[PDB]
Amino acid sequence: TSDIQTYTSINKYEVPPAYSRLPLTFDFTPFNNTEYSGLDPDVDNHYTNAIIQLYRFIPEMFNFVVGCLKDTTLLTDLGYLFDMMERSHGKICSSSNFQASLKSLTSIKRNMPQKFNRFLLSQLIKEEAQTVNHNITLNQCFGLETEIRTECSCDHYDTTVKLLPSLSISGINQNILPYIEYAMKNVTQKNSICPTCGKTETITQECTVKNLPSVLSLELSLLDTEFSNIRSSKNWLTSEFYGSIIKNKAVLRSTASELKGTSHIFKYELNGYVAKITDNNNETRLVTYVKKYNPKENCFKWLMFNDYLVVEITEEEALKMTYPWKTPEIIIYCDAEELRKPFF
Ligand SMILES: [Zn+2]
């Protein structure tokens, strides 16, 4: 017999109590002894709660969103929500209102967490645009400047530059750094019909991310076979790394000095991630790992959120990818200095 907040087991195949499917939702205090609020799972699309928690713990993000309340829209709803979650004392909060706003805009399936992540960021960034203020903060925080050049025979496929708020990660050909590097610079081929010519042709496209934004939001979009190689790789989920734009390419390394012939080096730290838990029943759910700075003790602590259960955990557990019941879904890296700023 174990307390529900027990978050390890001996055998890697047994889902520990803290990760289990919690009772339907009335006291939740036995599930949470922290000062951080969990979310009521009795809402539509309750898997979005894991992603709401994730963003709630990005300082640049929290602070900007709650700041808007001092100026209707699911930005401001997210504002009210974040604010309730901070000042509530670990008391449960509801994403009810936020869910409503989302709906108005008319089992965890493959890609749905990633799809919701892209939608949410894009939607927040667009609303941020709707203020005649400027009012760029989210755009500049998450914005990946992505250039697509096309080698083609017909001279049409004009180069495009779009600002994307997240980076989609697919397989390469071990740790996470080369995956991110590949997503930020790659050359691919595909069959295509030219919108201008109508010619069908194999085109070659070079996709280049131009900048290293202060928040990198990663959507893992891998095959389950690729996930099996991730679990076998110890230390796949790198906790911190250094990046630089070197010769029009993003280069990412574990240490700063591995970065050569570049004049500006940026440090990133893992802030949090959302993971899918798969039960023995094959029942499925999202949890959230986050890292929060305690500037008095000059250290970070790691928290795991499972709906309304919240438990402080070791960094070892927080970075462990080897559990067959665990799959990373969405990962956030954050400028190391930003990560230490206070939540207002
Ligand atoms: Zn053409």
- The widest CA-to-CA distance across the chain, in whole angstroms, is 70
How many angstroms is it from 208 CA to the middle of ligand 1?
A: 22
Provide the 10 A C-beta neighbour count for residue 68.
Answer: 21
Decide if 314 contacts 302 (C-beta within 8 A).
yes
How many angstroms is it from 189 CA to the middle of ligand 1?
A: 16
Cα–Cα distance for residue pair 20/102, rounded to 1 Å:
27
In the three-class reduction of DSSP (H, G, I as helix; E, B as strand; rest coil), residue 238 is classed as coil
How many angstroms is it from 151 CA to the middle of ligand 1?
A: 11
Decide if 317 contacts 262 (C-beta within 8 A).
no
Burial class (CB in 10 A: 0-12, 13-18, 19+), 159: exposed
Q: Which value in Å is the resolution of this experimental model?
A: 2.1
Phi, psi of 97 (to 5 degrees): -55, -50
Residue 156, marked binder: yes
Give the structural domain span for 62.
Answer: 1-344
How many angstroms is it from 203 CA to the middle of ligand 1?
A: 11
Find tokens 């808007």 and name the residue: 68
Neighbours of ion ligand 1 (CB under 5 A): 154, 156, 194, 196-197
Cα–Cα distance for residue pair 200/195, rounded to 1 Å:
10
Burial class (CB in 10 A: 0-12, 13-18, 19+), 10: exposed
Cα–Cα distance for residue pair 268/252, rounded to 1 Å:
10
How many angstroms is it from 187 CA to the middle of ligand 1?
A: 20
Decide if 222 contacts 170 (C-beta within 8 A).
yes
How many angstroms is it from 201 CA to the middle of ligand 1?
A: 9
CATH number at residue 298: 3.90.70.10
Residue type, 298: N
> Helices 74-87 and 112-130: crossing angle, nearest 10°?
110
Question: How many structural domains compose the chain?
Answer: 1
| Angle CA 261–219–252, to nearest 5 | 10
How many angstroms is it from 152 CA to the middle of ligand 1?
A: 8
Residue 197, marked binder: yes
How many angstroms is it from 154 CA to the middle of ligand 1?
A: 4
Residue 207 host element (H or E): strand 200-209
Residue 194, marked binder: yes
Residues 6+ apart with CB under 8 A from 270: 237, 238, 239, 240, 291, 319, 331, 332, 333, 334
